[PDB]
């Protein structure tokens, strides 16, 4: 695979969003990946509604601001036949009744792919697919107060991931 | 010296414009490759 990849350079990534005091990171990670795939498909980058996911994907297994999984959100989009734009269904940072409206749907999917649990496999996916949804162990003050450079935490775990985020590429420092 | 370019959802003031460089090829650091997926479109 290439030495370096940065999908932001190619228009696959929307500006950084803020989930606030709500455990809806799984929804942001999901909209991030969908945003990247829809762009690859249509050439148009449109911000997607995390609120839509927070309020409506309970049947698929998500728990709104109490947590969830990106795969459950992808399953919701597939079951629902769509997902509203961020503009049509603004983020509120708290769970509300489902207000999905098909007229405002700008995205859809036909399932999801779980990447083999190996960094080499993740690299191939990022290189050939685009931004990838992932979960990481962010349960450390070192992550909360991260400032710059390559993040490395000795006490990090590969078993208790608690934060859903988006890998938009990879590279190396000089 | 390798890293994964990660986009966070805690606003653009946190980290590097809302992004974080995470250790890559360091024994699946922080489980970054343990729950990775993407939607099929």
């Amino acid at each position: 695979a290439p030495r370096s990849v940065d999908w932001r350079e190619k228009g696959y990534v929307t500006p950084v969003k803020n989930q606030g005091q709500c455990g809806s990171c799984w929804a942001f990670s999901a909209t991030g990946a969908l945003e990247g795939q829809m762009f690859r498909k249509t050439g148009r980058l449109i911000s997607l509604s995390e609120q839509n996911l927070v309020d409506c994907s309970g049947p698929q297994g998500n728990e709104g601001c109490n947590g969830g999984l990106m795969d459950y959100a992808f399953q919701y989009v597939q079951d629902n036949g769509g997902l509203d734009s961020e503009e049509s269904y603004p983020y509120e940072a708290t769970e509300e009744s489902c207000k999905y409206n098909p007229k405002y749907s700008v995205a859809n999917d036909t399932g999801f792919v779980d990447i083999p649990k190996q960094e080499k496999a993740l690299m191939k996916a990022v290189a050939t697919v685009g931004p990838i949804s992932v979960a990481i162990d962010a349960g450390h003050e070192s992550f909360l107060f991260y400032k710059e450079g390559i993040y490395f935490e000795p006490d990090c775990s590969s078993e208790d991931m608690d934060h859903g985020v988006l890998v938009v590429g990879y590279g190396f420092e000089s | 010296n390798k890293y994964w370019l990660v986009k966070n959802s805690w606003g653009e003031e946190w980290g590097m414009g809302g992004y974080v460089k995470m250790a890559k090829d360091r024994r699946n650091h922080c489980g970054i490759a343990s729950a990775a997926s993407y939607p099929t479109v």
Partner: peptide, 4 residues
Amino acid sequence: XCXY
């Protein structure tokens, strides 16, 4: 933040 978390909640994955």
